[PDB]
């Protein structure tokens, strides 16, 4: 671990991007994560909220 | 806008509600602003027979 610092910079950036991309799958309370399904099986008034 | 409908269909006169009269013969937008007023008038529209 002589090059710990440079390696740490690279890994921190990669991990940040990965978690940002992964967070698209979370539902955050909505019935589903993909926008299409929400817009398919629900009326516009409820699809808004 | 004035007209006459059945009893259990008054719920269809509202934004974004899909039904049978809100689908084929009277539709109001999802960005509506106004009021609806419905009162029972079985006294004057119901003929015997």
UniProtKB/Swiss-Prot annotation, chain B:
Changing residue 47 to T: In strain: Omicron/BQ.1.1. Residues 6-8 are annotated as: Integrin-binding motif. It comes from the Viruses. Binds to host ACE2. RBD also interacts with the N-linked glycan on 'Asn-90' of ACE2. Cleavage of S generates a polybasic C-terminal sequence on S1 that binds to host Neuropilin-1 (NRP1) and Neuropilin-2 (NRP2) receptors. Interacts with host integrin alpha-5/beta-1 (ITGA5:ITGB1) and with ACE2 in complex with integrin alpha-5/beta-1 (ITGA5:ITGB1). May interact via cytoplasmic c-terminus with M protein. May interact (via N-terminus) with host bilirubin and biliverdin, thereby preventing antibody binding to the SARS-CoV-2 spike NTD via an allosteric mechanism. Attaches the virion to the cell membrane by interacting with host receptor, initiating the infection. The major receptor is host ACE2. When S2/S2' has been cleaved, binding to the receptor triggers direct fusion at the cell membrane. When S2/S2' has not been cleaved, binding to the receptor results in internalization of the virus by endocytosis using host TFRC and GRM2 and leading to fusion of the virion membrane with the host endosomal membrane. Alternatively, may use NRP1/NRP2 and integrin as entry receptors. This is Spike protein S1. The chain holds residues 398 to 446 of 1273 of the full protein.
């Amino acid at each position: 671990s002589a090059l710990g610092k440079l390696q740490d910079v690279v890994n921190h950036n990669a991990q940040a991007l990965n978690t940002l991309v992964k967070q698209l799958s979370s539902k955050f309370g909505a019935i589903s994560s993909v926008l299409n399904d929400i817009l398919s099986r629900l009326d516009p008034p409820e699809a808004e909220v | 806008d004035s007209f006459v409908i059945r009893g259990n269909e008054v719920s269809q006169i509202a934004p974004g509600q899909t039904g049978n009269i809100a689908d084929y013969n009277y539709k109001l937008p999802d960005d509506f602003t106004g009021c609806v007023i419905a009162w029972n008038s079985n006294k004057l529209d119901s003929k015997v027979g």
